[PDB]
């Protein structure tokens, strides 16, 4: 009876490596819940188990409140202070009630709550154990295969999950199969799987190379980037600080043995290993392997690169369904446009002609002078407006007065273009003029300006009938806005 509580607490504490305190708190909550179910009224109940005897007292409790909404769980401050003058709002008044007899009903409830706490703490221990192994390749046995996930057994009551997106597209696992994967996330969820394992993400490739290539595990070779199309093709970029070591040769190994071991573990995925370069253009040339690059043009402002290839290499540079260019773009972080040498020249000629047409139209210069600006590398009105005066003065035939005039024209052309778009839509001109009438939101101002009503005067000249087709404008609201516009324009 008494000594039996101690023997049960000791047996459970030793077998489940769990704090005795956490088991008692849970038994108290279990007994309180079992007690609540014997009363027809919703009562609040506290149970306290004596830690030496195993005896337990059951208390009905009331929350001390100002206004009682639930007479079964709440007591007024005036009534609480009649029993104990020390009580405040938010304290509990407690009456000792008859403790529920420990029948097989309470016994079953206690067993369920113990099993739940054992699971909660086994789960906390698994999270704490595997948190240090986040990013590493773990090995599990397939316990269950569902449509949307695979449950892995890692041993020691640890379960992991591979989601459908985290699998390779051609993998078929059976219960009892051994599977390797990277533990990429540990989640302390109260329900579900806590350990998330991937075979599809780039981290799986990096860690397979770390295991297969000692020089990566010894930090002699660094993997700088990895891009992956899971179960089809990957690219890895490798660097070394030791000039005596070829990083590509080390990752390939004798006759490709190392890269073939990684490829075999990934279901026959093709792996390209490229040298990392600190020059972006040289790194993209390396990333485009096995296609030979003829020239690269870098657009730093758009973060894009145009890659010219020989017409025979175009299909190899793009790859099957664009796979080669996409993996190179993901590996470099640059947007990569693959074209022929002839197409690149045609693109540059079209851009130069468009820049010449833009400069001739907006700067009131001749085509010969516009051509000189494009040959000196100016392509936009913004460059001409904002570039340091020294760079414009390095151009043969530009004097300080002509550069100042060119910049003033470029700024005025930019202002004109901005004002034109601001009157075409509702950016600034119609967002102030047409939107002067009280009630005009920015959307309505742009809808008005799309009909050619750009100013508060243009709106004052309209009829209700001219505006009736504008979505969100009722005849009454149209009439109010036209009258507000007329009051400002004609009577202000």
């Amino acid at each position: 009876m008494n000594k039996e509580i101690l023997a049960v607490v000791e047996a459970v504490s030793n077998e489940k490596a769990l704090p005795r305190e956490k088991i008692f708190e849970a038994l108290e909550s279990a007994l309180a819940t079992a007690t609540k179910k014997k009363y027809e009224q919703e009562i609040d109940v506290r149970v306290q188990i004596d830690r030496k005897s195993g005896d337990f007292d059951t208390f009905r409790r009331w929350l001390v409140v100002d206004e009682v909404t639930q007479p079964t769980k709440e007591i007024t401050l005036e009534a609480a202070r009649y029993e104990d003058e020390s009580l405040n709002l938010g304290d509990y008044v407690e009456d000792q009630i008859e403790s529920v007899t420990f029948d097989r009903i309470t016994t079953q409830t206690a067993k369920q709550v113990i099993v739940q706490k054992v699971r909660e703490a086994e789960r906390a221990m698994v999270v704490d154990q595997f948190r240090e192994h986040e990013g590493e390749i773990i090995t599990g046995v397939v316990k269950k295969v569902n449509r949307d996930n695979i449950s892995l057994d890692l041993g020691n009551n640890a379960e992991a999950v591979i989601l459908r997106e985290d699998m390779l597209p051609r993998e078929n696992f059976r219960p009892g199969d051994r599977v390797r994967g990277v533990l990429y996330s540990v989640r302390p969820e109260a329900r579900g799987a806590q350990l998330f394992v991937t075979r599809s993400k780039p981290e799986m490739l990096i860690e397979l190379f770390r295991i297969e290539v000692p020089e990566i595990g010894e930090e002699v070779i660094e993997i700088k980037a990895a891009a992956r199309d899971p179960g089809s093709r990957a690219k890895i970029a490798v660097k070394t600080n030791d000039k005596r070591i070829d990083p590509v040769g080390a990752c390939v190994g004798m006759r490709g043995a190392r890269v073939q071991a990684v490829s075999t573990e990934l279901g026959g995925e093709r792996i390209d290993i490229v040298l990392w370069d600190d020059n972006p253009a040289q790194f993209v040339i390396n990333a485009m392997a096995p296609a030979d690059v003829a020239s690269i043009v870098v657009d730093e402002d758009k973060h894009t690169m145009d890659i010219a290839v020989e017409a025979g290499n175009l299909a190899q540079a793009i790859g099957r369904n664009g796979q080669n260019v996409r993996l190179a773009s993901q590996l470099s972080g640059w947007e990569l446009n693959v074209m022929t040498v002839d197409d690149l020249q045609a693109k540059h000629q079209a851009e130069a002609h468009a820049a010449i047409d833009t400069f001739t139209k907006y700067l009131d210069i001749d085509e010969d002078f516009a051509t000189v600006l494009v040959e000196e590398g100016f392509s936009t009105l913004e460059e001409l407006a904002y570039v340091p005066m020294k760079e414009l003065l390095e151009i043969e035939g530009l004097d300080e007065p002509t550069v100042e005039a060119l910049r003033e024209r470029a700024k005025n052309a930019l202002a004109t273009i901005a004002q034109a778009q601001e009157e075409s839509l509702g950016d600034n001109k119609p967002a102030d003029d047409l939107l002067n009438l009280e009630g005009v939101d920015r959307d309505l101002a742009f809808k008005l300006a799309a009909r050619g009503v750009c100013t508060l005067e243009d709106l004052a000249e309209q009829g209700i009938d001219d505006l009736a087709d504008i979505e969100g404008l009722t005849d009454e609201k149209a009439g109010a806005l036209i009258m507000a516009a007329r009051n400002i324009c004609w009577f202000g």
Partner: protein
């Protein structure tokens, strides 16, 4: 289990007999209980309904 063994402390029963099952009755007929007789062999404790 340890929790079923804890019945010895508060309830007092050693092991709640040995098994657990309440003689429940079968189906096929409705009705309304109109009369209950309880006969007691002499010496046995009469319960509260007897």
């Amino acid at each position: 289990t340890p929790e079923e063994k804890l019945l010895r402390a508060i309830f007092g029963e050693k092991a709640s007999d040995v098994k657990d099952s309440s003689l429940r009755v079968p189906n096929g007929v409705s009705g309304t209980v109109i009369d209950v007789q309880v006969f007691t062999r002499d010496g046995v404790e009469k319960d509260k309904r007897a």
